[PDB]
Ligand SMILES: *[C@@H]1O[C@H](CO)[C@@H](O)[C@H](O)[C@H]1NC(C)=O
Ligand SMILES: *[C@@H]1O[C@H](CO)[C@@H](O)[C@H](O)[C@H]1NC(C)=O
Ligand SMILES: *[C@@H]1O[C@H](CO)[C@@H](O)[C@H](O)[C@H]1NC(C)=O
């Protein structure tokens with residue numbers, strides 16, 4: 001009777017989820033920024049979705065991680081009440097393009113897509129305040145996405161990391177380059193991920209973390225890319241690094 | 256190092272808003288009418304002095 | 305004695321090229337402005353913002369701009385424009401002002417302290433007043449709490465003020481939250497309908513893509529020229545810069561937190577900005593008793 | 599510091615104005631049943647004053 005099941009486990013975030021706070025170029029410099037970041041070495045919920053917890057709170061923001069080579073994950077639905085009363089954001093990803101639509105596409109607690117073609121999903125749309133199309137977000141490989149809404153703008157950051165021959169999330173920095181900022185100005189409270197099943201056997205695995213207001217210290221190389229980062233409140237050594245604004249701390253006692 | 260740090264601190268304080276809406280001066284020149292922008296430019300001048 | 309500056313020879317303005325013009329003729333002349341309780345919020349971006357068409361309409365009853373100088377609208381470049389269109393009574397129009405309180409200010413539409421925008425209010429009595437009366441225009445005079453800035457309240461919250469609900473019949477302390485506007489043409493100033501559009505000019509560190517009729521000037525190099533790149537104005541010399549921006553950022557900054565590189569909107573090359581020559585001037589002199597040569 | 603149609607198109611005062619405004623009713627002495635149309639105001643101009 002329980003069509004949808006989602007097994008949750010806990011995993012280590014390692015040093016992951018850092019993005020560019022603003023689109024300003026910096027080289028050979030350390031910059032301290034206060035913003036919503038994923039805390040280092042934080043607890044990340046690993047969800048295995050196999051065909052009853054459909055309510056994932058949005059909080060300040062969300063960090064999504066996908067690692068399947070099968071490319072079985074397709075799109076998202078963002079909504080406050082997730083019913084026809086309030087408008088909701090929806091994402092469609094197929095090989096040709098990506099379509100973002102702020103539309104009240106009514107789906108039950110088990111959203112999905114038909115698959116070939118998916119023309120059977122919706123005949124038309126009732127209301128759509130905002131629409132957008134682009135080259136598809138998704139191209140093993142790690143798809144790291146960060147979603148947030150601040151001062152009425154909904155911002156998405158992404159990184160498609162080509163993982164070397166290895167099993168789990170590496171201890172490397174993949175600074176998430178921003179893709180799209182939409183001035184949608186809608187309340188958001190919960191989000192749901194749309195697994196792709198064809199017409200049936202199918203499974204998905206993803207990682208979810210929640211961003212928190214934190215101060216970070218970011219390093220820019222001579223090329224402009226972020227190489228390392230320091231979370232100030234993680235441990236006293238990182239706090240000393242933040243106070244000194246240096247990744248190397250010399251011997252001594254620091255207030 | 257102390258001399259360099261003092262100069263860097265001065266140039267960094269050049270970007271502090273000191274309660275004004277904006278930190279750029281030519282921006283507030285082309286932004287606002289004189290009488291209401293005078294107070295914010297006063298705040299900037301006091302902070303910089 | 306004095307300080308020497310190299311004055312800017314020319315002024316270059318580079319704005320991105322968009323053929324499409326903003327739908328300013330749609331936010332006005334809409335023959336229907338909904339009501340104040342549900343005021344229309346239209347997004348304006350990625351288009352030419354020609355403010356002359358705004359002045360091309362009837363003489364405005366109240367054209368008051370708070371954070372922006374009205375004469376500088378064309379020069380300035382904005383990220384997004386939120387057009388808040390509604391209709392209110394004339395006497396309440398003055399309620400949208402600093403230091404002034406009113407029912408419309410707190411229960412229909414509230415503006416923030418740092419609001420940068422323009423309020424444009426004009427009469428439509430000769431076009432929107434009828435002897436029967438436009439009953440569509442209604443305002444909600446009851447709410448549980450005050451409205452935060454940029455908030456619209458349309459949900460029918462359960463207003464159980466007393467122990468027993470009125471249950472749809474008249475009684476003590478039982479009144480309709482929505483009060484229909486009385487549009488009698490014989491009424492003077494203070495009760496006639498007035499169309500109000502609030503253009504909120506939300507700008508921040510992002511590609512504005514919304515500027516104004518400004519013919520772009522050819523780019524110049526190795527000359528102290530007043531540059532205006534997407535609203536970032538400054539004085540300096542522009543040089544072809546070796547530094548490689550990532551495809552998505554447009555400004556460069558140094559350890560001193562100063563604009564050091566800029567990406568040209570039209571052609572995508574990185575330009576290094578160097579402040580043109582500034583210095584001090586010293587007068588080396590013998591005593592004025594000896595000679596006047598310096 | 600007060601803006602309006604009358605301020606910019608009819609009569610403009612400086613922000614640092616030092617003076618006194620004395621305004622009183624004169625309907626009983628300057629109004630006629632036919633209506634004195636000599637009193638007029640300019641609401642349209644190419645620029646401000
Ligand atoms: C991908 O989805 C878009 C949705 O707008 C559709 O227009 C397009 O035809 C699709 N591409 C396919 C089915 O190859
Ligand atoms: C679309 O918008 C209208 C107006 O807000 C609303 O009445 C309607 O319920 C919305 N959705 C549908 C089902 O059309
Ligand atoms: C950045 O560009 C320089 C050449 O300008 C190159 O030497 C360097 O390796 C690049 N950055 C990285 C991290 O590869």
Ligand SMILES: *[C@@H]1O[C@H](CO)[C@@H](O)[C@H](O)[C@H]1NC(C)=O
Nearest residue numbers: 329332333334335336361431
């Ligand atoms: C107003 O808009 C209508 C269409 O909605 C148009 O027919 C009419 O000519 C317009 N007139 C003006 C500029 O007021």
Ligand SMILES: *[C@@H]1O[C@H](CO)[C@@H](O)[C@H](O)[C@H]1NC(C)=O
Nearest residue numbers: 320321322520569570571572
């Ligand atoms: C318009 O802008 C595009 C985008 O950079 C540019 O390629 C093109 O040359 C521009 N056309 C002009 C300036 O006439």
